[model samples]
Target chain A: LATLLGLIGGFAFVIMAMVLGDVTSILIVVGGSIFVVLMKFTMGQFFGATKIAGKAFMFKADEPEDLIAKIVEMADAAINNTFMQKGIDLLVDGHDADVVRAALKKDIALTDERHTQGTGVFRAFGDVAPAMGMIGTLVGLVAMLSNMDDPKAIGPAMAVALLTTLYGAILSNMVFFPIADKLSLRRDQETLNRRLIMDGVLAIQDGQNPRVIDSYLKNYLNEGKRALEI
Target chain B: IGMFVDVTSILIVVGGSIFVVLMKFTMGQFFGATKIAGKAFMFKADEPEDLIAKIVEMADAAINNTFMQKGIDLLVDGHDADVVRAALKKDIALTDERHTQGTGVFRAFGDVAPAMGMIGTLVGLVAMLSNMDDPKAIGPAMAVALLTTLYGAILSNMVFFPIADKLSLRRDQETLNRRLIMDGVLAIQDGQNPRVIDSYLKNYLNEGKRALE
Candidate 1:
């Protein structure tokens, strides 16, 4: 729960600050910050960003061996039902290696394109959030200064300015940026996996020894996994 | 600034919510969640074609990464399909197990954030009511009550839950890529003609049912 700790740590510092002095102004400052940040993003981008962020925590990668097993099983059964299954069928039927590689590469490229689109949106949101937060503070300051004549309204006005900046800082540092980064990370991981498959298939086509292919493909795994006796 | 800084509210909202979160999740899970969240923000990307070309070139030069080089060396040595398939399929189960753990942590965070917000709100309300007789105490107490609830809502709705969703989506994308690789490797091993194999692989892009089904 490092996530909780980070959050708690930030709050603890702020809370401690509260104990030593007044924090009402800081709390009020957030009002303008939240409003401006929300205004910076369109409803669609906000919703879309939220949807993309949800993907960061999901773990959906299949075991490489299970897929390999499925591929082998399909080959044995002489069934080319799915696209990948069909690829196997073509290979079995004695297709050219260059043709096979070309086809798979195209699919990999297209998939990469789609993934990039998803990351772009989140990245945009991350970039804009902090800027929006700053704008909120500027707005708050202008409002506070204009109302300086009414000493009674000064505290609330200043609170609006300061609190918005805090909200923006927290939202950007803790939320938007992190989500965008994760989506990008996931993209890289997927690309690596795709390459592994491409390499594995190419090795198979070249008619390498099964044991040798296994050891080679196993290189794609991390150190901990690679060391495990499989 | 002194007039606005409400220590009581900050303590109740921030401190109270954290305690509630701690109570809801185990220490390990809480820590694990944060680690996984961090992963979303940091990673490096490599091109598949470049990787494939390297492997091919490395095979020709007879200088390869010890890990992947061996597999290529085997193919050049003319190993059969069955033997190759068995080799490639060996370590996948372990990888799958590791990925599962990452996702579980994020999911738990999503579940806890909103609950913590509600708790903050409740704390604030209690504090405000108890100090109702003191006008000065009531304002700050009420601020504590409202701000904590606000923080909770924003944290969960804006951050925690969204990251969880993105992680799940990323997982699916990875699985599909892995599956594609599996098929590609098998076709290569089976001695299928490259052109036919290419058409089959292309089908994955256009025919969703064919690839996913």
Candidate 2:
């Protein structure tokens, strides 16, 4: 939606004109790109892509310091997060140390797998959109040759040709690729925070002092921002 | 008065997307989408600060706030975090799925329109090529062909796409609000200090959206 709106606002400002929407342009560029985009995934993943795109604009709410402090917050009480949540379950239940560490490691691994699948939806969109633009490029170019003797059709055919390339980058660069990249950005933050959560949970389970728990979790923070203030 | 709008293209694209939409999502969406399409536009988002404020209010009045529904009411009654987080997590999880279900249909509606338009254009071509001897009909023929595509894109970008995205944004906002409430109530139940609970709740917001007090 916002993606199409972004596409809509462009004008050839110096070129002295805004253009009309063309069926041909939309079909080959927007339609065909998504058509090819959808074909790569099964029905479920394609639907899941809709779900992922929904979250693209949202940020993961907490940070490393936020989670680390929370781990200390929850741990002092003896906390989070998903892995943090599961790891704590093990703690209160009195699991052996090996199970706690191993399960948390496994939790981290499985989470990465799911996040990768979610990110791949849009990443795949980026890969194919530009390539579809090339296919579009060939369509326009081939059609132009069909009118080679009609010289007038050449420029128009080329107009038909270039838009697919334009849309290719527009979707891939502005839309698909950006979402794909942001998902990874989100992934990094969550993974680190979850790690912080794991460390805090384990520390507390070992009967470390609350102050000791604070010291351990504090290491997860970068030194500069770890200060007295917000 | 003549070619720009016509029944042929109108029925093809508009009606086409709808029929497919009916089969694609038969149960809940058709009626609900009508409401949300505009719901997206009409809404002004309730900020995270407001949610935090309410949670703080609930905590301050704990074991007694009016906003203390059955879920949080359980915590106030001394049920423990396991029962509370589990009950609220069930609420959040089911609600999340339902929220996505609504937006999914909006997205489905958006996806189908252009495909239907493409098919409409093909039909237009079939109608046109069969009777080219009447050259005067050519312009109307293309007009019919092109408008099918035009209406589809407009429905897509103007209507369905924005609806889906805004609904997604709405779901995130609500989800955050509920999570903040759960965390705040639980922290209070754990006897974490109010100021400390404030800090934890503020974790739900960005620096800009974080309320100072």
Candidate 3:
């Protein structure tokens, strides 16, 4: 929701900028940037990142304490949170820590690679969009000067010429640039959560006390971010 | 001089430059050049003395690291140098591959820009002259639009070619740094004397740097 707040806020300021908007600029930068990314990335990756960028906004971070607490509860009872749940099932099935660690890690590694690919698309948009915007602006200038003698119309022509450049920058800064970074930040956060679960699940499988499982798992949590049993 | 600036002319050259260069590279490689472009002008690499000394020690270290740490971490954790070589070599090769592709993207852009400008002028002449069969306006429009060639030549010579060259320079420096590190790490793992490690790594240093060190 906070991400949405910033996303919405970005466009709001863009909106209040004298209320000038151009469809040609929209097509050139927005359409051009997206198509160029398509050219670079394939069809599958396009919408995969489309969904990932949206999900980054929808991604609610797990509290480290909540994660550790969940770990402790699993240690005591024995768990759908899929990767972690799968780890717990292995624990009850009495697998060795190394066996379970390898199993859980495959799931973690696959997701890590998937999101690493996701970050690239938004960043591609950020990189390609502005240049396309400038190209469009240049395109407009040619048209603008080609018919330069339209006295009163020259004012509107200049607006049309510059809009592509402005929209390109706005789209990159407000949308793709930050969305790429947000995807990265979320990806790292996801890595830590899954890795923590792996450590917690393995320690519990090794027959550590719930308290020790709690203590060992908390080692992964940052000191200031620790939420329980300080 | 200001008359020399024409939007249509600039666009034809630049727009065609993108059209041609984009075809030569993938979108990822295309965008990657932008990121690499910044580093071409500004690079801050670790000095060879520190790298040699650190390699001598871990044989030792990261307060901040990602790549060499992959090898160094294992070595520090009590594995033999041979144990870490597989991981480090792939890391180094992949990095070199990345740098190679990045440099190519810029180089391709520089190559395409001037050539695309000439092609753009042909397109420009066609677009402009079809409106007039008379030789009167045709010469003016043709002369005006020749500016596309001007812009293209300027971009290739002044802008893109230099960026491509600068990227190659930075890439060479980084490749040298890593290869030397790989050598130094192996030497340290074999328990070579600090004296030998320093003398060997100094070959990677420039003549100026070697004299100073």
Best by lDDT: 3
Q: Model 2's DockQ?
A: 0.02
- On lDDT, the stronger of 1 and 2 is 2
Cand. 1 TM to true fold: 0.42
Ranking by TM-score: 3, 2, 1
Per-residue lDDT tens digits of candidate 3, residues A80-166? 366777776787777677767777876686667667777777887887776677667766776676677869998998888788888
TM (chain A) per model: 0.62, 0.71, 0.84
Give the lDDT ranking, best first. 3, 2, 1
List pairs with backbone clashes in candidate 2. A75-A78, A80-A85
For candidate 2, give the lDDT of residue A36.
Answer: 48
**Candidate that beats the other on DockQ, 2 or 3, i.e. the better one:** 3
Interface RMSD in angstroms for candidate 2: 13.5
After superposing candidate 3, which stretches have Cα over 4 Å from the reference? A1-21, A78-80, A223-230, B1-108, B111-213
List runs of model 1 lying over 4 Å from the truth: A1-230, B1-33, B44-97, B202-213
| lDDT digits (tens) for residues B187-213 of candidate 1 | 655656665656565555532211211
- Scored against the true structure, residue A146 in model 3 reaches a CA lDDT of 67
| Shift in Å, residue B210, candidate 1 | 16
Error of 1 at A170 (Å): 27
Task: State which candidate, 2 or 3, has the greater TM-score.
Answer: 3
Give a tens-digit lDDT track for model 2, residues A1-230: 98776656544322222232355764676666565444334456566555655664664547676666566666556533456666667787878888788778766765565456667767867766765665566556545644567667667778877777776776677667878777776666567766777777677777687886676666556444234444
Query: Weakest 10 consecutive residues, lDDT, candidate 2 chain A?
Result: A12-21
